[PDB]
Amino acid sequence: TGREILEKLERREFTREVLKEALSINDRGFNEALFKLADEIRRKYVGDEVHIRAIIEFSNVCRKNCLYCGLRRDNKNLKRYRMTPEEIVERARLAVQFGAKTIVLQSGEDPYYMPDVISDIVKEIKKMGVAVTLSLGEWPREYYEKWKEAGADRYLLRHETANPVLHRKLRPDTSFENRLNCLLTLKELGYETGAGSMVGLPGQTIDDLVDDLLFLKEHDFDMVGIGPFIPHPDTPLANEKKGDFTLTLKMVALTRILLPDSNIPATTAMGTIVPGGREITLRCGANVIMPNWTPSPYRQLYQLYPGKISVFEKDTASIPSVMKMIELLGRKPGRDWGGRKRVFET
Ligand SMILES: C[C@H](CCC(=O)NCCC[N+](C)(C)CCCS(=O)(=O)[O-])[C@H]1CC[C@H]2[C@@H]3[C@H](O)C[C@@H]4C[C@H](O)CC[C@]4(C)[C@H]3C[C@H](O)[C@]12C
Ligand SMILES: C[C@H](CCC(=O)NCCC[N+](C)(C)CCCS(=O)(=O)[O-])[C@H]1CC[C@H]2[C@@H]3[C@H](O)C[C@@H]4C[C@H](O)CC[C@]4(C)[C@H]3C[C@H](O)[C@]12C
Numbered sequence: 001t002g003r004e005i006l007e008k009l010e011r012r013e014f015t016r017e018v019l020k021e022a023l024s025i026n027d028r029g030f031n032e033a034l035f036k037l038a039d040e041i042r043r044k045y046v047g048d049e050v051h052i053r054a055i056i057e058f059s060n061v062c063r064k065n066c067l068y069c070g071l072r073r074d075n076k077n078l079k080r081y082r083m084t085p086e087e088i089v090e091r092a093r094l095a096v097q098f099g100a101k102t103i104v105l106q107s108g109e110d111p112y113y114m115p116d117v118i119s120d121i122v123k124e125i126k127k128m129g130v131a132v133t134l135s136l137g138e139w140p141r142e143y144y145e146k147w148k149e150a151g152a153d154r155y156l157l158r159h160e161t162a163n164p165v166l167h168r169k170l171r172p173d174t175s176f177e178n179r180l181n182c183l184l185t186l187k188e189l190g191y192e193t194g195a196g197s198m199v200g201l202p203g204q205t206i207d208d209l210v211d212d213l214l215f216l217k218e219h220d221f222d223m224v225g226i227g228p229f230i231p232h233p234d235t236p237l238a239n240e241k242k243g244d245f246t247l248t249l250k251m252v253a254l255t256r257i258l259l260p261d262s263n264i265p266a267t268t269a270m271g272t273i274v275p276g277g278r279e280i281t282l283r284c285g286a287n288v289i290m291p292n293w294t295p296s297p298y299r300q301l302y303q304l305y306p307g308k309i310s311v312f313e314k315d316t317a318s319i320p321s322v323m324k325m326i327e328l329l330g331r332k333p334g335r336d337w338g339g340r341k342r343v344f345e346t
């Protein structure tokens with residue numbers, strides 16, 4: 001019964017069977033109660049502030065060939081671009097002028113910048129008195145150390161899938177063991193570390209999703225980014241099914257219940273599969289939003305998946321838009337950098 005599962009969730013009995021049953025039950029009443037629980041846990045632990053992370057997708061060059069990704073190296077039907085360091089720093093300054101208190105630098109795994117151009121950019125942005133988050137993929141420990149010395153605060157590296165067999169198949173350049181090692185290194189070096197996963201990957205099962213939740217709980221990540229898999233037409237997975245919004249929303253809600261003091265975004269992928277999907281997610285456990293701050297003409301070239309929102313409006317629309325969103329949700333903008341505020345418990 002759904003009631004018994006909520007009760008166990010409420011009492012923090014986070015066993016594999018409780019999580020599987022939560023993900024397996026499709027009853028509307030159960031789902032709504034689950035979302036309300038997550039919403040309330042969010043409010044009690046991390047409050048009503050929604051933290052804004054302005055993302056600059058500074059290069060769509062990638063050396064890897066992940067099967068799901070539109071930036072995979074085998075995709076010749078994409079115009080590749082690189083922003084200059086000056087462009088990236090000045091675009092970050094514009095976001096800070098617009099009120100962003102974290103700048104996210106995201107790219108394909110593009111060797112050109114690595115490690116020293118990144119270090120130089122990070123130092124320049126840190127002079128602006130904001131947090132800097134990097135999401136550059138897998139690199140040597142030395143690179144991650146140089147970027148931490150340069151001033152980077154956080155690093156996003158979704159674990160993608162905690163099933164090693166499926167991980168290797170979908171990411172043939174690498175492995176779950178390497179992904180995990182990178183995440184452990186980043187934690188050791190003192191980054192706030194973000195993990196997370198896609199929901200609805202071809203071949204991924206409900207038990208796989210459970211394992212993603214247990215993985216997250218085990219490592220106590222500061223941030224958890226979750227969204228659906230969205231097939232991209234220029235990839236091997238073009239004809240596979242998109243991930244289900246509701247199932248993905250349940251993964252966000254359970255992540256909040258399991259990691260009550262974590263930072264959890266309402267991802268752009270949630271708002272791509274369903275109109276208004278970010279706003280729903282912010283009411284089901286999420287507390288972070290990541291407006292796209294990539295300038296034209298590059299913005300439209302950063303297509304990890306199609307339909308990726310926020311492309312036809314002026315490239316300065318997204319920060320204002322998310323501030324309006326936060327108000328109409330009855331929430332507040334973050335006042336500080338929105339680092340994790342751990343609540344130590346039993
Ligand atoms: C807005 C709609 C429809 C509400 C509605 O239209 N219900 C009929 C009228 C109710 N009113 C009280 C306005 C008047 C009643 C007098 S009347 O004369 O109209 O019958 C309601 C119906 C189900 C609600 C979601 C679920 O909970 C799950 C979840 C819980 C979180 O915590 C917050 C997020 C989320 C997604 C909820 C959001 C929102 O809240 C929903 C969509
Ligand atoms: C960038 C330009 C020119 C002046 C400038 O370069 N301004 C730097 C401000 C730096 N900060 C954001 C750190 C100030 C924080 C002050 S505060 O008192 O908010 O703490 C200034 C002039 C008017 C400013 C907008 C309006 O105001 C309305 C609105 C307020 C929200 O709030 C943030 C978003 C928004 C759209 C603003 C963005 C930006 O800012 C604008 C465009």
Ligand SMILES: Nc1ncnc2c1ncn2[C@@H]1O[C@H](CSCC[C@H](N)C(=O)O)[C@@H](O)[C@H]1O
Nearest residue numbers: 068069108109136137158228229230304305
């Ligand atoms: N087709 C697709 N559908 C939904 N999410 C996708 C996707 N392709 C990629 N992503 C997501 O995009 C995220 C950032 S990719 C850019 C950063 C870095 N190259 C990296 O791989 O970490 C990935 O972690 C993955 O979860």
Ligand SMILES: CC1(C)S[C@](C)(C(=O)O)N[C@@H]1C(=O)O
Nearest residue numbers: 156225226227267268269290
């Ligand atoms: C490119 C991503 C999948 S990674 C990020 C920023 C996150 O979850 O941290 N959300 C993005 C999106 O949903 O488009």
Ligand SMILES: [Cl-]
Nearest residue numbers: 053102133154
């Ligand atoms: Cl961040």
Ligand SMILES: [Se]
Nearest residue numbers: 139140141182
């Ligand atoms: Se690493």
